[PDB]
CSV table of N, CA and C in Angstrom, one decimal:
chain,number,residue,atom,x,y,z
A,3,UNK,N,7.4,-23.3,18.8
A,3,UNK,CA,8.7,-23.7,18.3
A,3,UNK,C,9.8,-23.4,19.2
A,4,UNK,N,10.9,-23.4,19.1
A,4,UNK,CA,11.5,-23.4,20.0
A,4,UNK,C,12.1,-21.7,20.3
A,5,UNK,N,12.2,-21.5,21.3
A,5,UNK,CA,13.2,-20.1,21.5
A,5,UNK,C,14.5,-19.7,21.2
A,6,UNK,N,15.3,-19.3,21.3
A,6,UNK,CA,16.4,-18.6,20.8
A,6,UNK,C,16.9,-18.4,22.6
A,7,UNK,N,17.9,-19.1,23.0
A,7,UNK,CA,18.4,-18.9,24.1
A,7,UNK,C,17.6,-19.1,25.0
A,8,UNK,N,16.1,-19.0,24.9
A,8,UNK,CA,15.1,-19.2,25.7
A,8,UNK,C,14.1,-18.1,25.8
A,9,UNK,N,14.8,-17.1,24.7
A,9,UNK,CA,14.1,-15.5,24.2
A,9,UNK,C,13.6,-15.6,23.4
A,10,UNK,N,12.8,-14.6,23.0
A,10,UNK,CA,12.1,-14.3,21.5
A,10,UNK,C,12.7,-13.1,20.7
A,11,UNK,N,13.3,-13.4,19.5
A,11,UNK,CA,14.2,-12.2,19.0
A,11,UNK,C,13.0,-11.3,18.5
A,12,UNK,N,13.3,-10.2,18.7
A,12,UNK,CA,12.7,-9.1,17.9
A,12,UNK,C,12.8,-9.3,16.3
A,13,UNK,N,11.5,-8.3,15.7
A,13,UNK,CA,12.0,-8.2,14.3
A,13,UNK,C,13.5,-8.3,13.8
A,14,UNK,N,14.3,-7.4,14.5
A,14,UNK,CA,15.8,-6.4,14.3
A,14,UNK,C,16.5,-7.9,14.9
A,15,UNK,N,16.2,-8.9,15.2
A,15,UNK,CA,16.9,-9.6,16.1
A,15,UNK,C,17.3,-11.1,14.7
A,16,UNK,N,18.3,-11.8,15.0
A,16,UNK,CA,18.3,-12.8,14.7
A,16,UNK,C,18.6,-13.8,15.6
A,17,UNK,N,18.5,-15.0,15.6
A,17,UNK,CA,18.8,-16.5,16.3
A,17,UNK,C,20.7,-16.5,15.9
A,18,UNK,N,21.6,-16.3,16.6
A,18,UNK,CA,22.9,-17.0,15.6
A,18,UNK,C,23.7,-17.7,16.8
A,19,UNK,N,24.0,-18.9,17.2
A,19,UNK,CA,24.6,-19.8,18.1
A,19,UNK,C,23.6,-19.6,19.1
A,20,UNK,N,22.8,-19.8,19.2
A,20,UNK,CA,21.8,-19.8,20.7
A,20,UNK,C,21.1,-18.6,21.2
A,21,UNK,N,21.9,-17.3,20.8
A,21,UNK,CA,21.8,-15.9,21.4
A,21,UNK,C,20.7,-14.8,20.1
A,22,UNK,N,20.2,-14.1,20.6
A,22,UNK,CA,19.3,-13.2,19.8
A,22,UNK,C,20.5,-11.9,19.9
A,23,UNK,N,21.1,-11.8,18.5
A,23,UNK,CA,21.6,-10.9,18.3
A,23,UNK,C,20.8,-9.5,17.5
A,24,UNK,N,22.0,-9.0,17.0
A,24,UNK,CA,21.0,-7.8,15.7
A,24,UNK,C,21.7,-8.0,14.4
A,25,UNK,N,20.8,-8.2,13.5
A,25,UNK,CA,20.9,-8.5,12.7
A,25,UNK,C,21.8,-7.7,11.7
A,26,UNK,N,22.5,-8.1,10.7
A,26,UNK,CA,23.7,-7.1,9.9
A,26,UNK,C,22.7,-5.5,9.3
A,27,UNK,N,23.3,-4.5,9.7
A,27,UNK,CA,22.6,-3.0,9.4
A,27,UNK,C,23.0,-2.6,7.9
A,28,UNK,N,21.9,-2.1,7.0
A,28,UNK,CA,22.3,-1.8,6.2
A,28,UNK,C,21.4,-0.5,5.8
A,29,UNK,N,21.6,0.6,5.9
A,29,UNK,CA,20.9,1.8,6.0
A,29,UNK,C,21.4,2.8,5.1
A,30,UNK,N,20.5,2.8,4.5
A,30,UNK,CA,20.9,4.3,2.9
A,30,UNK,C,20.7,5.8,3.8
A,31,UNK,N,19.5,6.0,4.8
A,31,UNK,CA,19.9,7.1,5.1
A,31,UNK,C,21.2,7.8,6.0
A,32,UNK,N,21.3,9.2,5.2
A,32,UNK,CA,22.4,9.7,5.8
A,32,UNK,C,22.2,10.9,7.0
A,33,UNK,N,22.3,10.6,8.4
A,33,UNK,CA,21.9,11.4,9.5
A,33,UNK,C,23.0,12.0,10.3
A,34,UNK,N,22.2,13.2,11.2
A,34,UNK,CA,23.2,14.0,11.5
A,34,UNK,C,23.8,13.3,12.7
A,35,UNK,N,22.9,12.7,13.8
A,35,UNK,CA,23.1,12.1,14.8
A,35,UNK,C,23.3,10.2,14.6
A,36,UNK,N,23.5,9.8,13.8
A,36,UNK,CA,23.4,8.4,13.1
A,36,UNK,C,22.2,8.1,13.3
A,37,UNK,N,22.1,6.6,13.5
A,37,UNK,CA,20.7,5.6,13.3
A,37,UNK,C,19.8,5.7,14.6
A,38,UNK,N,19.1,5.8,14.4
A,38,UNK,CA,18.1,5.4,15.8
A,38,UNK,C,18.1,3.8,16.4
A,39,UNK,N,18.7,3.7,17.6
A,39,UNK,CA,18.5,1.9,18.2
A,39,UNK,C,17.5,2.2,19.0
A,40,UNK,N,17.0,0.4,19.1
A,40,UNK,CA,15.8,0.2,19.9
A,40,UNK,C,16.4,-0.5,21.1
A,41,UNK,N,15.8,-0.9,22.1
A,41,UNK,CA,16.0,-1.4,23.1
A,41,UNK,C,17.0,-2.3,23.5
A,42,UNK,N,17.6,-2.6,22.4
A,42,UNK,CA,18.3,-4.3,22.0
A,42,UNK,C,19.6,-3.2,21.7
A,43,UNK,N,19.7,-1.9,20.9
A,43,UNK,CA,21.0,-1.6,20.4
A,43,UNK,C,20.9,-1.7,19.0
A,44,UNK,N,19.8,-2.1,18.5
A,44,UNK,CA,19.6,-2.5,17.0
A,44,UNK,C,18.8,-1.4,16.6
A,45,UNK,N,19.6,-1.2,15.2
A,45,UNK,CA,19.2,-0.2,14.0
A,45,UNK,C,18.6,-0.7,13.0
A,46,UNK,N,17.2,-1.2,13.5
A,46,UNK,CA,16.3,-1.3,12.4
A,46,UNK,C,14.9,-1.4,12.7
A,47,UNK,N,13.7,-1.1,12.0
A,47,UNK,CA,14.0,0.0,11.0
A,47,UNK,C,15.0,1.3,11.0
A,48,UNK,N,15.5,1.3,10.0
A,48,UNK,CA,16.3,2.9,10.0
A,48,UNK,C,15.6,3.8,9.7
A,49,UNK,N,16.0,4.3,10.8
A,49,UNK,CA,15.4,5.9,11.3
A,49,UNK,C,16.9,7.0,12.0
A,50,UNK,N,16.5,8.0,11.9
A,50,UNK,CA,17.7,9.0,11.9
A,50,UNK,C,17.9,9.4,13.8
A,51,UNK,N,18.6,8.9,14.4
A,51,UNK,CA,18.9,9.3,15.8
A,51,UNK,C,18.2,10.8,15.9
A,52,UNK,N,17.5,10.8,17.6
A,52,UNK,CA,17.3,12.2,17.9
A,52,UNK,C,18.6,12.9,18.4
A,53,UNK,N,19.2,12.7,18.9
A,53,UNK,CA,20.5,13.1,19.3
A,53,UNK,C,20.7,13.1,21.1
């Protein structure tokens, strides 16, 4: 099927105008260091930053 910009978005990623962005974050847990990002900058799964 076709690519996304010509990329493949990650789980955490979405397709929106051409570009694999990250998707809207929505995370219950409360951390001392915030969310943990992955490679992309994206917070999901949420997981609690190492610091």
């Amino acid at each position: 099927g076709n690519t996304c910009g010509g990329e493949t978005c990650s789980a955490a990623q979405v397709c929106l105008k051409g570009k694999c962005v990250c998707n809207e974050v929505h995370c219950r847990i409360r951390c001392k260091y915030g969310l943990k990002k992955d490679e992309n900058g994206c917070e999901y799964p949420c997981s609690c930053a190492k610091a």
